[PDB]
Amino acid sequence: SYIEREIKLRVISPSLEEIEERIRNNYTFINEEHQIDIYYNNPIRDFRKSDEALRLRNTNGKVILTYKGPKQSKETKTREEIEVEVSDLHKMDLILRKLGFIRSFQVEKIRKNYKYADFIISLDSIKELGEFIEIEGINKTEKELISFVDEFVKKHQIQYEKTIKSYLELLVEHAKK
Amino acid sequence: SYIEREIKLRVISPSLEEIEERIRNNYTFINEEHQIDIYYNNPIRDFRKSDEALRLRNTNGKVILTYKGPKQSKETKTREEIEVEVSDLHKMDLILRKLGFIRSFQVEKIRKNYKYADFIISLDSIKELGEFIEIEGINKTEKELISFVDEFVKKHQIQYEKTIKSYLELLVEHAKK
Ligand SMILES: [K+]
Ligand SMILES: [K+]
C-alpha cells in the first residue's frame, strides 16, 4: 500500500487553457488522459460512512482497479491507495457485480499532466463539474506540498478554492443543486 | 460471462507419468503450469452455501482473478466463470482484503495440458491430494464431453472415479481425515 497525498483546487480564475499557457514554458508536459471512472458501493460497508472507495478506471484504454481508504488529513487529500491494472474492464465490472458490489456513480474527465521537480500538476476538466487542478507529491511532506501549492497559485496568478472532497462527493453535491 | 464445462477424474490406475506415456503420441502437448491458487470467502454470502468461488491464481507467473458461479449440472462440473488478468498478485489480494474478503484455503498443483480435437486434457498433480485428470470442452455439449471422457479412459486403460466436487472442496474433505 501507498499513501496518496494531493491537493485539489476549484479554479475560479483564469481558464485552464489560460493556466496551461502560463505554465507551459516552465513545466514539462507529461500526457493527456481521458479518464472514465465507475465507482462501487457494498451494501454491508457504506463507503460513504467508512470513507472508502472502489473505482474501475478506464484511462486512455488502460484499465485500473483502485481501493482508497479513509482520509488521513484535513489540510490535504491524504488516503491509502492500492491499485492494480486489469485486462478487461467489462469482465472486472461483471466480477464486482457478481460479488455483490453495486455501481454507484460515474466520473469522467480530461486530465493534462505536467511535471516540475517531484510534483505532478494535473489540469482537470470534469464533465458537469468544471475546471480543477490537482497537485500530488512524490516523496513529499504535507508541509512541502502546502508550500508548493501556495507558490504555484501565486506565481501563475490563479484564483482558487481548496477542497479535500473527492470528485465523487462533489458530483453528488452538484446533482442536487 | 462463459460457461466452463469440465469433468474431473481421480486417477486410481495408472500413474500420471504412465498415462502421459500412453497419450504422448496421439495428443499434442500444450504446456506445463505451476498453479498456486488463493480462495476467498465473504462473511455476507457464504460461498459454501451459495456455491460460488473467488480465486487469485498465480499460474507460471501470470495472475488471474476468477469468479465461479453455482454448479449447473450433476453429470459434469458446469459453472459460470468470469476471469481477468491482473498486474500484481499482492496488491489484488490486498484490495480484496481491504474490501472485507477473507483468505480461505490455498490449492497448489502442477498441471500438464494436452490438446486432441477441441478437448483440453489436463494431467493434474495436486499437492496433498494426489493425481487427477480434467477434460474441458471447447464449443462442446455435456453429451459430447461424457462420450469423449468415456472413450479417453478406455482407450488408455485408466481406472478412475468421476467427481464434480472442486479441488477446494476435496482438500477440505481430505484435511479432516
Ligand atoms: K485522484
Ligand atoms: K478448474
Active site residue B2: no
- Retrieve residue A110's grid coordinates: 480530461
Residues of A in contact with B1 (CB under 8 A): 94
Shortest CB distance from B88 goes to which of A84, A98, A100? A84
For chain B, after which residues does the C atom lie more than 2.5 Å from the next written residue's N, i.e. where is it broken?
none
What method was applied to determine this entry? X-ray
Name which of A9, A5, A18, A1 is nearest A156 in CA terms. Answer: A18
**What is the three-class DSSP state of B24?**
coil
Q: Which of residues 99-128 of B touch A (CB under 8 A)?
A: 99-100
Q: Given CB atoms, is B139 within the 8 Å cutoff of chain A? A: no
- Cβ–Cβ < 8 Å for A41, A133: no
Binding residues of A for ATP: 8, 55, 57, 68, 77, 79, 109, 111, 167
- Retrieve residue A40's grid coordinates: 462501487
Distance from CA of B157 to the nearest CA of A (A): 41
Q: Given CB atoms, is B2 within the 8 Å cutoff of chain A? A: no
The number of the ligand nearest the C-alpha atom of A83 reads 1
The distance from CA B164 to its chain's CA centroid, rounded to whole angstroms, is 10
Q: What is the resolution of this structure in A?
A: 2.7
- Retrieve residue B88's grid coordinates: 500484481
Q: Given CB atoms, is A53 within the 8 Å cutoff of chain B? A: no
The number of the ligand nearest the C-alpha atom of B124 reads 2
Do the chains contact at B100 and A42, CB–CB below 8 Å? yes
Contacts within 8 Å (CB) and 24+ apart, B71-76: B71/B164, B72/B3, B73/B5, B73/B142, B73/B164, B74/B164, B75/B142, B75/B146, B75/B164, B76/B5, B76/B6, B76/B7, B76/B142, B76/B145, B76/B146, B76/B164
Distance from CA of A18 to the nearest CA of B (A): 38
CA distance B13 to B30: 23
What are the structural domain ranges in chain A? 1-177
- Cβ–Cβ < 8 Å for B120, B99: no
Shortest CB distance from B95 goes to which of A82, A91, A94? A82
Q: Given CB atoms, is A75 within the 8 Å cutoff of chain B? A: no
Tell me the three-class secondary structure of B58-95, residue by residue.
Answer: EECCEEEEEEEEEECCCCCEEEEEEEEEECCHHHHHHH
DSSP letter at A66 equals E
The residue of chain A with its CA nearest to that of B42 is A99
With 0-12 CB in 10 A as exposed, 13-18 as middle and 19+ as buried, what is B135? Answer: buried
DSSP codes joined into one string, A123-145:
EEEETTTEEEEEEEESS--HHHH
Do the chains contact at B42 and A100, CB–CB below 8 Å? yes
Give me the residue label for grid cell 501470470: B62
Instruction: Give chain B's end-to-end CA distance (angstroms, integer).
Output: 37
Do the chains contact at B95 and A67, CB–CB below 8 Å? yes
CA of B68 to the centre of ligand 2 (A): 10
The number of the ligand nearest the C-alpha atom of A136 reads 1
Do the chains contact at B95 and A85, CB–CB below 8 Å? no
DSSP codes joined into one string, B149-172:
HHHHHHHTT-EEEEE-S-HHHHHH
- Cβ–Cβ < 8 Å for B78, B142: yes
CA distance B38 to B130: 19
Provide the greatest CA pair distance for chain B.
50
